[PDB]
Write a protein that binds this ligand. Structure first.
Ligand code: N4N
Length: 327
């Protein structure tokens, strides 16, 4: 099998009510206190709006949930409650319903969103270190709380570049980690899916989020966004193997006794592992250092067990300038 190296038993060590989200009974407040101002986004099971709480003039985000998804609603709510006060996790202010339809909605703190496509082309070296450190705080926190985000990607990493604030949003795909549990591999954005997902390995853990974080780090320091740009899930793995190497992929599969879908045999080809320095050029050289490449190499590994944990990543020398500045 496989287990997480950290936080493996933390849900089993807590009360059942902590993780048994199907049994959770939210307290649903009144959505009539909120005035919707503008639509911010739409997903397949939700839409997000800027809103004002008319009772106190607070600006918030309201996420209106398509109500058919009862179990998934309880999951997201219970996870957000468990994460209350976590560093750099979006703050759930309240759980409300339209008092007539009973359609549920989540109310979050407002954050200014600096558009990531534009931001990621103008970050400094220190900015990347700073924001990656802030994102790692959120991931170490949720992992320590027994929760995998499973959808880490630029859209879900809200950065207010004016106030130097970061929030990890959209916990709708998040799940509780339980050792030996088999999880659905249909999670994360294509470009941020770990190799484990792409090879249909269900016994994954928090380390999935560390792959996604590694993909974000690579895109920031190299300026290629997304870094691994597959055309479909099959091609996604080919794009990874063209960097990490094919023999290296096969060694990972062997270690975990992973069966490979035979459609891959026609498309993977044969590829040597590439040096990370191959991605440096005049446009990104100022963002790349030996310590950035060492960190990245320890995140973007096939072997999920061998990837750095969020805490190990935070402790890496790449972040020393950040820690020193916040002291
Ligand atoms: O699902 C969630 O947890 C969640 C929580 C908060 C925000 C969002 N989603 C979005 N927020 C924006 C945004 C916010 C402020 C200014 C401009 N855009 C665009 S999409 C989703």
């Amino acid at each position: 099998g496989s287990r997480a190296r950290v936080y493996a038993e933390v849900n089993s060590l807590r009360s059942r009510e902590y993780w048994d989200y199907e049994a959770h009974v939210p307290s649903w407040g009144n959505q009539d206190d909120y005035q919707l101002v503008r639509k911010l986004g739409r997903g397949k099971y939700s839409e997000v709006f800027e809103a004002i709480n008319i009772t106190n003039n607070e600006r918030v985000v309201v996420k209106i949930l398509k109500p058919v998804k009862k179990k998934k609603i309880k999951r997201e709510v219970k996870i957000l409650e468990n994460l209350r006060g976590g560093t750099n996790i979006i703050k759930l202010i309240d759980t409300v319903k339209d008092p007539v339809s009973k359609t549920p909605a989540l109310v979050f703190e407002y954050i200014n969103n600096t558009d990531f496509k534009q931001l990621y082309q103008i970050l400094t070296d220190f900015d990347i270190r700073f924001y990656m450190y802030e994102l790692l705080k959120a991931l170490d926190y949720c992992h320590s709380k027994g929760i995998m985000h499973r959808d880490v990607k630029p859209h879900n990493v809200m950065i207010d570049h004016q106030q130097k604030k970061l929030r990890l949003i959209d916990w709708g795909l998040a799940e509780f980690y339980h050792p030996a549990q088999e999880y659905n591999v249909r999670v994360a954005s294509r470009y941020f899916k770990g190799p484990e997902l792409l090879v249909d390995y269900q016994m994954y853990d928090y380390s999935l989020d560390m792959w996604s974080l590694g993909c974000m780090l690579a895109s920031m320091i190299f300026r290629r966004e997304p870094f691994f740009h597959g055309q479909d899930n099959y091609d996604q793995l080919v794009r990874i193997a063209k960097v990490l190497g094919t023999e290296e992929l096969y060694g990972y599969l062997k270690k975990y006794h992973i069966d490979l879908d035979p459609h891959f045999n026609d498309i993977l080809g044969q590829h040597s592992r590439k040096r990370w320095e191959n991605f440096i050029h005049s446009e990104n050289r100022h963002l790349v250092s030996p310590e950035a490449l060492d960190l990245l190499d320890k995140l973007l590994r096939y072997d999920h067990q061998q990837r750095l944990t969020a805490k190990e990543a935070m402790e890496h020398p790449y972040f020393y300038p950040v820690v020193k500045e916040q002291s």
